[PDB]
Design a protein around this ligand. Structure first.
Ligand SMILES: Cc1cccnc1NCc1ccccc1O
Lengths: 243, 256
């Protein structure tokens, strides 16, 4: 019958793939600023997800064609033996788009590759996108970017996680990494293997939104609060218990 | 514990105020002819269903039928400016058609950000740190009716309203996501609202609210239309979603 506490079956041979697309620099014609600190984010995410059982694959500064090719490749292999799929974007963005090295890519194109009829072996399984992307400004310094990327939904069993909501600001420390990724990774490390994942994301919401912007080193950044959000199309409770 | 102090993985919104709070329902069944929008038969079932479920959870429910945009704005501004100091939370429901960042009132559209903006920070100080929950059943009205002055059937409308976020401690709940379709039975009401209300009744007073919304996601996305009744509705799946800016666990336990 109908089960109020039903969980995604996470008893497969493998947890699954976690893809990370990391962008630090951009083709000069795009006139986008470098993203110092993003490599800290990449490393942090890599440890957390690998500790959760994911097979983590990182890609640095791919051109759009290369990026599309790689994600299409992954969408077309069998995930039959996997619990789930994770995809992380660390870049600048605008509207429905995230930037690769040389051009933008639509988020809907990326998520569309993992919808039911495109990726049968992921049907009914969690498909999690984590997006750290905002408006590029055209030792440890905090850079502040206006929210620009739409907090888009996707298909059933997708979970779309965004560093920042409309009207707020994304922060990135050049040594320590992004506020959002730091707090996400801290929560993953402590609670990732026990807490329901949207419960955990809610903790991240609290952590990030409570960071004070009262007295920034850069006075221009005062009052520029960060509020993350996630859009859930999940249909069951999601845990990452040790396999 | 003996007394608490640190970062708590299981922190819950404090729901021990004198009152649960206000639940606003804006119910729109018909529209000014110049808008060229179809009527929304079944929405009154949705309104009544929601009224019962939220009142059982302790909310003070106020319904408004077919308000003009100016009246709507006035009313919600009125609620945003009173003191919610004695309240746990705030709920606002829109039952209408919509487009992009807009929801239709009787005579004009209103931007969702205009509505949520009224309840941010010191615009509504007494709701700061409290759940502010918007539930939006709004999609694209099928316009095969004229620009002139004018049984249980399932109407199927394309998703049209952006699944917009808002401020901290907002929870924005949407009947349908981009690329899918919202369904409304002309007697029984909307798929989304029916399933939301059933889950509220069975689990609302114990389940964490986003967990409950996740149940609604499952219920709705698994619904099929009777192939013989409307073949055109084949492949028009409904996938709801919610955008959470919540910072704590939200329960509606019976108030003492
Ligand atoms: C068009 C849209 C679709 C879904 C969600 N939000 C959308 N627009 C609002 C918006 C603007 C800037 C940054 C984030 C953000 O969410």
């Amino acid at each position: 019958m109908f089960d109020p506490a039903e969980k995604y079956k996470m008893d497969h041979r493998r947890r699954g793939i976690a893809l990370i697309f990391n962008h630090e620099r951009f083709f000069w014609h795009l006139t986008l600023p470098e993203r110092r600190g993003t490599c800290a984010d990449r490393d942090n995410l890599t440890r957390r997800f690998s500790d959760l059982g994911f097979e983590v694959k990182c890609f640095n500064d791919l051109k759009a064609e290369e990026l599309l090719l790689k994600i299409h490749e992954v969408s077309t292999v069998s995930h039959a033996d996997a619990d789930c799929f994770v995809c992380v974007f660390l870049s600048h963005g605008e509207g429905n788009h995230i930037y690769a090295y040389d051009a933008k890519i639509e988020i809907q194109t990326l998520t569309g590759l993992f919808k039911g009829d495109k990726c049968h072996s992921l049907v009914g399984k969690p498909k999690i996108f984590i997006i750290q992307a905002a408006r590029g400004n055209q030792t440890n310094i905090t850079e502040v970017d206006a929210a620009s990327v739409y907090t888009l939904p996707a298909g059933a069993d997708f979970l779309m996680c965004y560093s920042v909501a409309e009207g707020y600001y994304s922060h990135r420390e050049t040594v320590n990494g992004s506020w959002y990724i730091q707090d996400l990774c801290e929560m993953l490390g402590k609670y990732g293997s026990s807490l329901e994942f949207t419960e955990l994301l809610t903790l991240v919401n609290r952590k990030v939104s409570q960071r004070r912007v009262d007295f920034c080193k850069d006075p221009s950044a005062i009052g520029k609060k960060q509020v993350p959000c996630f859009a859930s199309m999940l249909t069951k409770k999601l845990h990452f218990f040790p396999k």
